[PDB]
From a paper:
Surprisingly, we found a marked increase in potency by introducing a methyl group, a fluorine atom, or a chlorine atom (compounds 7–9). Further potency increases reaching single-digit nanomolar potencies were accomplished using alkoxy groups (compounds 10 and 11). Again, combinations with several substituents at the 6-positon were evaluated (compounds 12–18); this process produced a set of highly potent compounds containing an alkoxy substituent. No strong local interactions with the protein were observed, leaving open the question of the molecular basis of the pronounced effect on potency that this substituent had. Later, when we characterized the binding kinetics of the series, the 6-substituent was identified as a major modulator of the off-rates (data not shown). Key selectivity factors comprised a single interaction at the hinge; steric bulk under the nucleotide binding loop; and not deducible from kinase domain crystal structures, substituents pointing to the front pocket.
Interleukin-1 receptor-associated kinase 4 (IRAK4) is ubiquitously expressed and is a central regulator of the innate immune system. Upon binding of the respective ligand, TLRs (except TLR3) and receptors of the IL-1 (IL-1R) family signal via IRAK4. In this process, ligand–receptor binding is associated with recruitment of myeloid differentiation primary response 88 (MyD88) protein to the receptor, where it interacts with IRAK4 forming the myddosome. In summary, IRAK4 appears to be indispensable in TLR/IL-1R signaling, and activation of the IRAK4 pathway is associated with inflammatory and autoimmune disorders such as atopic dermatitis, lupus erythematosus, hidradenitis suppurativa, and rheumatoid arthritis.
Residue numbers in the entry: 165 to 185, 189 to 217, 222 to 334, 343 to 459
C-alpha cells in the first residue's frame, strides 16, 4: 500500500481509455474500472465519479477498512490517488472479472461449471463471514461486487458503503433486503443480498432483467415457494455437471437467506456450514 500520482494512473490506463477489450473493464454508480500496469504487476484502477462530498467519504471509508486488510476472499487495495482532479483506487487485478460477467459469459468466456459455482459460493460466504466477525456490514453484496482471480477464487469488492437507521438509503435495489430499502443498517441485510447472489448462481439470470417476466429474480423464488414452479425449471441450462440434490441444497440456503423477516434469516456462520454440508 502506497500513494500513486494521478498522472501515473492516467499514463498506465492510456489516458483512461473508455474503449473496452482499450482499457475499460467495467463500471458502476461510483465510477469506471480500468486495466493498468504499475510497478511490475497488472492492476485495476477505479476512477471515482458520480455528491462530490459523499464520493470522497466512500473513498476515505474504502481506504480506512482495506488499507491494511488481507484475506483470501476480499480484494487487495494496493493504494490510491487524490493529488489529481479525480479520486482513484488501485487494486490487484482479477483476471476473470465479476461473477455477474462470468454468469453472463461476457466476451465469449465459457459457462462456469456447477463445481466452480459451489466453490465461488463458499468463497464469497467466507468473505462475508470475515467482515461480520470484524463487525463490518458490506451494504452492497451482489454478483458484480464478487470478483474472480487467476484460480476463480471469490473476492468481495466495494467497501465505500461498508459500516441503527439511516437517512440516505444506498445500495443496489435488485439485491437489497426490505429493511435495507427502509434505511435499516444490519448485517442480516448482507445475508439477504447473498441469497439473491445464490439465485443468480443457480439460474445464471441477473437479479433484474427489465425485458424478463418476472423482472426481479426474487419473484422466481416467491413463485417456487408458492408451489407454482420448482427450482428444477430455472437451473442454468449452460451447465452439464449440475445435480438436482446439491442445487436444492444451495436453493434451501438461498430461501432461508431471502426470509422477509430479518431475525428468521441464518447468520453468515450458519450459511457457511450449510454450504460446506452441500459439498462435504
Ligand atoms: C469491477 C469489475 O471490473 C473488472 C472486470 C474485469 N474483466 N476482466 C476480464 C476481461 O476483461 N475479459 C477479457 C477476455 N478474457 C477472455 C477474460 C474476460 C478482468 C476484470 C477485472 C475487473 N476488476 C478488478 O480487477 C478489480 C479488482 C479489485 C477491485 C476492483 C474494483 F472494482 F472494486 F475497483 N476491481
Amino acid at each position: 500500500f502506497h500513494s500513486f500520482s494521478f498522472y501515473e494512473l492516467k499514463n498506465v490506463t492510456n489516458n483512461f481509455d473508455e474503449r473496452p477489450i482499450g482499457n475499460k473493464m467495467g463500471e458502476g454508480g461510483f465510477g469506471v474500472v480500468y486495466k493498468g500496469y504499475v510497478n511490475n504487476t497488472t492492476v485495476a484502477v477505479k476512477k471515482l465519479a458520480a455528491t462530490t462530498e459523499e464520493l470522497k467519504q466512500q473513498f476515505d471509508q474504502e481506504i480506512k477498512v482495506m488499507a491494511k486488510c488481507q484475506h483470501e476472499n476480499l480484494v487487495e487495495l494496493l493504494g490510491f490517488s487524490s493529488d489529481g482532479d479525480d479520486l482513484c483506487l488501485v487494486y490487484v487485478y482479477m483476471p476473470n472479472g465479476s461473477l455477474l460477467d462470468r454468469l453472463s459469459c461476457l466476451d465469449g468466456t465459457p459457462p462456469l461449471s456447477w463445481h466452480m459455482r459451489c466453490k465461488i459460493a463458499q468463497g464469497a460466504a467466507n468473505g462475508i463471514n470475515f467482515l461480520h466477525e470484524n463487525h463490518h456490514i458490506h451494504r452492497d453484496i451482489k454478483s458484480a461486487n464478487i470478483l474472480l482471480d487467476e484460480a476463480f477464487t471469490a473476492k468481495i469488492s466495494d467497501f465505500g458503503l461498508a459500516r441503527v437507521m439511516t437517512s440516505r438509503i444506498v445500495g443496489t435495489t435488485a439485491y437489497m433486503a426490505p429493511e435495507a430499502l427502509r434505511g435499516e443498517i444490519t448485517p442480516k441485510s448482507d445475508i439477504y443480498s447473498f441469497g439473491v447472489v445464490l439465485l443468480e448462481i443457480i439460474t445464471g439470470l441477473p437479479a433484474v432483467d427489465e425485458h424478463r417476466e418476472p423482472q426481479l429474480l426474487l419473484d422466481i423464488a416467491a413463485a417456487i415457494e408458492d408451489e407454482e414452479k420448482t427450482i428444477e425449471d430455472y437451473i442454468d441450462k449452460k451447465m452439464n455437471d449440475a445435480d438436482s440434490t446439491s442445487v436444492e441444497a444451495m436453493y434451501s440456503v438461498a430461501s432461508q437467506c431471502l426470509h422477509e423477516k430479518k431475525n428468521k434469516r441464518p447468520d453468515i456462520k450458519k450459511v457457511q456450514q450449510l454450504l460446506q454440508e452441500m459439498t462435504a
